[PDB]
């Protein structure tokens, strides 16, 4: 129990993230280091440097809350669209600043909620989350074959993306509907920017009237019994995706894609896919829980493999050079990585069902990941 | 004509009405009507004669779609199949086998719902009238579409085209422009003097003169819009632009999380209005707009208004409308803000709801006893909110004085 729980509380990673078993200098250095590679491309590349200096002086200096919101929205509203990659990091660090000190309550949360509820900020953060993820973790995850096991709801748990935890949870505590709104937005952006590559147009997201219908259902749940037009279609598509998910011989790609949107639309608008008869007959909820635990654990092996291979692939501007992870082996690694992986597998295997149509989604990826990860820890 | 449609699948009435016009069963010599109203009416007696049955209600206050009876399909086939009578119905054989440009003259083209994008050859046919591409996965359309002087329809819902070419302004004749809101219209829209219905016009980050050009388009009956980027006095232009044309029969303005700086308190609406919808429930009017009076717009059959607060006299004023067949009034204060569910008090009047079958006071503290002496003579449906603490001094009653066939309530947690 504590044999590894103590170890995960001591090393450099695994603290910023939450494990299914259950720092100011670090980002200050990255802030300082951001301005180095900017000047090397001066040979149109000056506005980014101006923005970087503005953000650096904004974060480092002390500003009264009555002016900080204006300062942070001035820079954030200006950015619109190798050059492109440097631009995304400009706003990713920009809206990290809000969460950076809100945890210290340098800004009243009432003003923070007032800022976020603006239609611009919601879309901006929903877009920048998927862009930041695809910029860094997608390349590493593509090699392992865990590319299809990247879930929008599950992105907040990675250590880098810890500055969406507050933006979602505090918002949910204070303003219920906007949390589901930005969840819908972020999954729409994820499905549009290649995180879920599909040829057909998405029928659940990137459409204002769909969200309006979902919200109208949310506030008056007795609409599901006798819904009007434009909600027959949404329920029919839910049923079609559920049937695709529950299939046995269906292709893995499109089945996982259907599961992802089904999980999003059921988590953020609860009681939309819950059928009393069919779900009980086909063990719907248990299968969803099994697949969700499978996705969590797959992200866990992904992080473990990235850490073991690093001993930069966490991502550009992710971890600074001084605070990097050295290649040298350590005494505790042998006694605390194999056991950690084994306990993760044991915990996963105890509350995941087995079936002819589920073993390919829960058991088979777990065994494949175990085989891949047990043959490279010494090397 | 429906024999072209397959055996077992729903049929939308809008496509039938448009294609009948396009190929030529609709000709009006009166020049007092726009040959769209009569087409819809024609479909109305067609469904009236019990030959076809209705299914659903679309966003035009009419039947969404229909389905022909199975014993009538073979009947119409036997009547008019062997005699002389192109489209793709969920078939992938198109393109790789059949050649479309080979046909020298053809009246209508409809290939919606397919997964093929090879349309760049529209200049080979000129007698074409209907051009529908709903959900055909078409990336782009040819630049020389303007050659088709004869044109009535242009269907582009659910496609990947991101901007229309400017060579559609030259179209001397055009009736319906089914545009998705995401893609931007070309400028100079005012030259489309014969435009008849305009659906889901994307309207944001647009200069004022384009808005002014709309009012030259004096032939509308439905006008579905939205806006996200000019929440300022720019919309004051379209405020009076909508006032110029006098043939409105439906209208709705989608807009999210903001006060409606679109419709003014001193405005003259078209003398005819039926739908006047507001699909987005996150928006609100400051109060009940002053232009809703028994004097003007006395022909509403649909309200669907969300507003920040429902005053005690708001429902009193709403009850004075002559027809008001359907009524759905929301209460933004109760749901999105911590405000008590106040109970309305309708006292004056005698009839107060001549023909109001549907009434959906979502979030309103309306009570069945609050209607005095049959305030709603028919009221087939009713929704309201009833906090549990209201059990004192004969609040509810529910006298059943007005034969409410069904009726659904919402419970409240407190007390």
CATH of the domain at B19: 1.10.10
Which residue is closest to B406 within chain A, CA to CA? A226
CB contact under 8 A, A219 and B281: yes
Q: Where is the domain boundary, A77, A100, A116?
A: A116
> Residue A346's closest CA among A74, A21, A40?
A21
A87 occurs within a structural domain: yes
Look at the block and give the residue holding tokens 């109001």.
Answer: B356
The set of residues, in sequence order, having a beta carbon less than 8 Å from that of A232 and lying 6+ positions away, is: B56
Q: Closest approach of chain B CAs to the CA of A227, in angstroms?
A: 11
User: A85 and A6: one domain?
Assistant: no
Are B164 and B133 in contact by the 8 Å Cβ rule? The answer is: no
Please state the φ and ψ torsions of residue B163, each to the nearest 5 degrees.
Answer: -160, 135
CB contact under 8 A, B59 and A230: yes
Beta strands B52-57 and B11-12 are: unpaired
User: How far apart are the C-alpha atoms of A22 and A27, rounded to whole Å?
Assistant: 27
User: How far apart are the C-alpha atoms of B296 and B268, rounded to whole Å?
Assistant: 8
A124 occurs within a structural domain: no
Q: Closest approach of chain A CAs to the CA of B298, in angstroms?
A: 26
Residues of chain A in contact with residue B408, where contact means CB-CB under 8 angstroms, are: 222
**How many domains would you assign to chain B?**
2
Q: Where is the domain boundary, B28, B50, B80?
A: B80
Of A200, A216, A229, the CB nearest to B281: A216
DSSP percent split of chain A into helix, strand, coil, nearest 5: 70, 0, 30
User: How far apart are the C-alpha atoms of B215 and B337, rounded to whole Å?
Assistant: 39
B128 occurs within a structural domain: no
Q: Where is the domain boundary, A65, A86, A116?
A: A116
User: A289 and A373: one domain?
Assistant: yes
Residues of chain B in contact with residue A222, where contact means CB-CB under 8 angstroms, are: 383, 408, 410
Residue A82: C-alpha distances to residues A45, A89, A317 (Å): 11, 12, 14
User: How far apart are the C-alpha atoms of B140 and B122, rounded to whole Å?
Assistant: 12
Look at the block and give the residue holding tokens 């035009």.
Answer: B60
Edge-first strand order for the sheet with B52-57 is: B11-12, B63-68, B52-57
- Cα–Cα–Cα angle for A216, A172, B261, rounded to 5 degrees: 50
Of A119, A220, A232, the CB nearest to B256: A119
User: Is A216 in the B-facing interface, judged by CB distances under 8 Å?
Assistant: yes
B148 occurs within a structural domain: no
A267 occurs within a structural domain: no
User: Is A2 in the B-facing interface, judged by CB distances under 8 Å?
Assistant: no
Residues of chain B in contact with residue A220, where contact means CB-CB under 8 angstroms, are: 362, 383, 410
**3-class DSSP assignment, residue A78:** helix
Q: For chain A, first and last CA: distance in Å?
A: 27
User: A299 and A365: one domain?
Assistant: yes
The two structure tokens encoding residue B341: 């569910």
A286 occurs within a structural domain: yes
To 10 degrees, the CA torsion angle through A289, A291, A297, A298? -160
Residues of chain A in contact with residue B335, where contact means CB-CB under 8 angstroms, are: 219
What is the residue range of B331's domain?
Answer: 284-415
C-alpha A170, offset from chain centre: 17
The two structure tokens encoding residue B225: 């819009």
Query: Residues 59 to 118 of A: which have CB under 8 A from any B CB?
Result: 117
User: How far apart are the C-alpha atoms of A163 and A40, rounded to whole Å?
Assistant: 29
**Local structure of residue A355 (DSSP, 8 states):** -
User: A379 and A284: one domain?
Assistant: yes
Q: Which helix (H) or strand (E) holds B56?
A: strand B52-57
User: A289 and A378: one domain?
Assistant: yes
User: Is A201 in the B-facing interface, judged by CB distances under 8 Å?
Assistant: yes
The DSSP code sequence of B259-277 is: B--SS-SS-PPPS--S--B
Q: Where is the domain boundary, A55, A87, A116?
A: A116
A152 occurs within a structural domain: no
Q: Where is the domain boundary, B80, B110, B141?
A: B80
CB contact under 8 A, A216 and B59: no
Q: Closest approach of chain B CAs to the CA of A201, in angstroms?
A: 8
Residues of chain B in contact with residue A119, where contact means CB-CB under 8 angstroms, are: 228, 256-257
Edge-first strand order for the sheet with B108-110 is: B108-110, B130-132, B153-155, B176-178, B197-201, B223-226, B252-254
The two structure tokens encoding residue B354: 């001549």
The set of residues, in sequence order, having a beta carbon less than 8 Å from that of A343 and lying 6+ positions away, is: A4, A21
Question: Which residues lie across from B284 on neighbouring strands?
Answer: B259
B24 occurs within a structural domain: yes
Are B137 and B116 in contact by the 8 Å Cβ rule? The answer is: yes
Are B341 and B365 in contact by the 8 Å Cβ rule? The answer is: yes
**How many domains would you assign to chain A?**
2
User: How far apart are the C-alpha atoms of A366 and B10, rounded to whole Å?
Assistant: 44
Which residue is closest to A223 within chain B, CA to CA? B408
Q: Closest approach of chain A CAs to the CA of B186, in angstroms?
A: 22
What is the residue range of A324's domain?
Answer: 1-22+275-379
User: A292 and A333: one domain?
Assistant: yes
A56 occurs within a structural domain: yes
Please state the φ and ψ torsions of residue A4, each to the nearest 5 degrees.
Answer: -100, -25
Q: Where is the domain boundary, B47, B80, B113?
A: B80
CB contact under 8 A, B281 and A177: no
B223 occurs within a structural domain: no
CB contact under 8 A, A209 and B254: yes
Residues of chain A in contact with residue B306, where contact means CB-CB under 8 angstroms, are: none
A143 occurs within a structural domain: no
**3-class DSSP assignment, residue A79:** coil
A61 occurs within a structural domain: yes
Q: How many CB atoms lie within 10 A of CB B47?
A: 15
User: How far apart are the C-alpha atoms of B245 and B269, rounded to whole Å?
Assistant: 10
User: How far apart are the C-alpha atoms of A147 and A139, rounded to whole Å?
Assistant: 9
User: How far apart are the C-alpha atoms of B250 and B57, rounded to whole Å?
Assistant: 14
């Amino acid at each position: 129990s504590k044999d590894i729980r103590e170890y995960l509380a001591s090393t450099f990673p695994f603290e910023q993230q939450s494990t299914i078993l259950d720092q100011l200098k670090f980002r200050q250095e990255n802030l300082a280091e951001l301005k180095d590679q900017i000047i090397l491309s001066l040979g149109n590349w000056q506005k980014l440097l101006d923005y970087t200096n503005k953000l650096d002086e904004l974060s480092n200096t002390k500003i009264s809350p009555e002016e900080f919101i204006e300062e942070i929205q001035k820079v954030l509203y200006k950015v619109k669209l190798l050059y492109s990659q440097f631009n995304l990091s400009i706003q990713d660090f920009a809206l990290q600043i809000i969460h950076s000190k809100y945890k210290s309550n340098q800004i009243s949360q009432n003003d923070l909620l007032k800022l976020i509820t603006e239609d611009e900020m919601l879309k901006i953060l929903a877009k920048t989350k998927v862009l930041t993820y695809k910029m860094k973790y997608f390349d590493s995850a593509s090699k392992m074959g865990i590319n299809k096991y990247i879930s929008t709801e599950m992105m907040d748990l990675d250590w880098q993306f810890s500055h969406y935890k507050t933006f979602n949870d505090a918002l949910k505590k204070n303003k219920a509907s906007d949390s589901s709104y930005l969840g819908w937005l972020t999954h729409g952006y994820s499905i549009k920017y290649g995180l879920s590559p599909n040829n057909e147009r998405s029928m659940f997201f990137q459409d204002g009237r769909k969200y309006a219908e979902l919200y109208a259902f949310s506030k008056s749940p007795h609409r599901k019994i006798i819904p009007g037009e434009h909600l027959k279609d949404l329920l029919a598509k839910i049923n079609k995706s559920k049937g695709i998910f529950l299939d046995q011989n269906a292709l893995l790609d499109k089945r996982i894609y259907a599961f992802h949107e089904l999980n999003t639309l059921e988590t953020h608008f609860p009681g939309i896919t819950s059928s009393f008869t069919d779900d009980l007959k086909s063990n719907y909820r248990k299968k969803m829980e099994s697949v969700s635990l499978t996705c969590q654990v797959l992200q866990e092996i992904g992080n473990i493999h990235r850490f073991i291979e690093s001993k930069t692939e966490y991502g550009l501007f992710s971890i600074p050079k001084i605070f990097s992870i050295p290649i040298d082996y350590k005494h505790g690694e042998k006694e605390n990585l194999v056991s950690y992986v084994d306990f993760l597998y044991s915990t996963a295997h105890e509350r995941i069902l087995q079936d002819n149509s589920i073993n390919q989604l829960c058991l088979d990826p777990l065994q494949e990941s175990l085989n891949r990860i047990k043959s490279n820890i010494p090397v | 004509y429906l024999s072209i449609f397959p055996e077992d699948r729903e049929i939308r009435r809008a496509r039938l009405i448009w294609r009948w016009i396009s190929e030529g069963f609709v000709y009006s010599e009166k020049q007092d009507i726009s040959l769209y109203e009569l087409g819809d009416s024609y479909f109305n007696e067609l469904v009236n004669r019990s030959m076809i049955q209705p299914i659903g209600i679309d966003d035009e206050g009419k039947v969404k779609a229909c389905r022909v009876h199975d014993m009538v399909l073979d009947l119409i086939c036997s009547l008019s199949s062997e005699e002389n009578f192109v489209t793709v119905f969920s078939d992938n054989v198109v393109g790789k086998v059949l050649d479309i440009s080979r046909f020298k003259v053809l009246r209508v083209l409809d290939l919606e719902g397919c997964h093929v994008s090879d349309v760049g050859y529209v200049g080979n046919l000129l007698h074409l009238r209907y051009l529908g591409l709903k959900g055909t996965h078409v990336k782009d359309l040819p630049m020389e579409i303007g050659k088709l002087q004869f044109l009535l329809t242009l269907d582009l819902r659910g496609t990947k085209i991101e901007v229309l070419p400017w060579s559609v302004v030259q179209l001397r004749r055009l009736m319906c422009l089914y545009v998705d809101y995401g893609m931007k219209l070309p400028s100079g829209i005012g030259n489309l003097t014969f435009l008849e219905v305009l659906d889901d016009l994307g309207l944001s980050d647009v200069d004022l003169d384009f808005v002014k050009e709309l009012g030259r388009l004096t032939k509308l009956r439905v006008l579905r819009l939205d806006f996200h980027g000019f929440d300022q006095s720019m919309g004051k232009a379209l405020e009076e632009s909508i006032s110029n044309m006098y043939k409105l029969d439906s209208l709705d303005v989608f807009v999210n999380r903001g006060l409606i700086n679109c419709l003014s308190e001193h405005w003259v609406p078209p003398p005819r209005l039926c739908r006047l919808a507001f699909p987005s429930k996150r928006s609100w009017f400051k109060t009940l707009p002053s232009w809703i009076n028994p004097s003007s717009l006395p022909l509403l059959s649909y309200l669907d208004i969300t507003l920040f607060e429902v005053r005690s006299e708001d429902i009193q004023l709403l009850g004075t409308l002559p027809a008001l067949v359907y009524l759905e009034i929301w209460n933004y204060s109760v749901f999105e803000e911590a405000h008590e569910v106040e109970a309305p008090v309708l006292s004056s009047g005698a009839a107060l709801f001549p023909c109001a079958t549907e009434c959906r006071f979502i979030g309103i503290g309306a009570v069945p006893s609050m209607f005095p002496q049959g305030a709603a003579p028919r009221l087939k449906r009713l929704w309201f909110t009833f906090p549990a603490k209201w059990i004192s001094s004969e609040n509810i009653g529910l006298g059943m004085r007005h034969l409410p066939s069904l009726q659904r309530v919402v419970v409240d947690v407190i007390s």
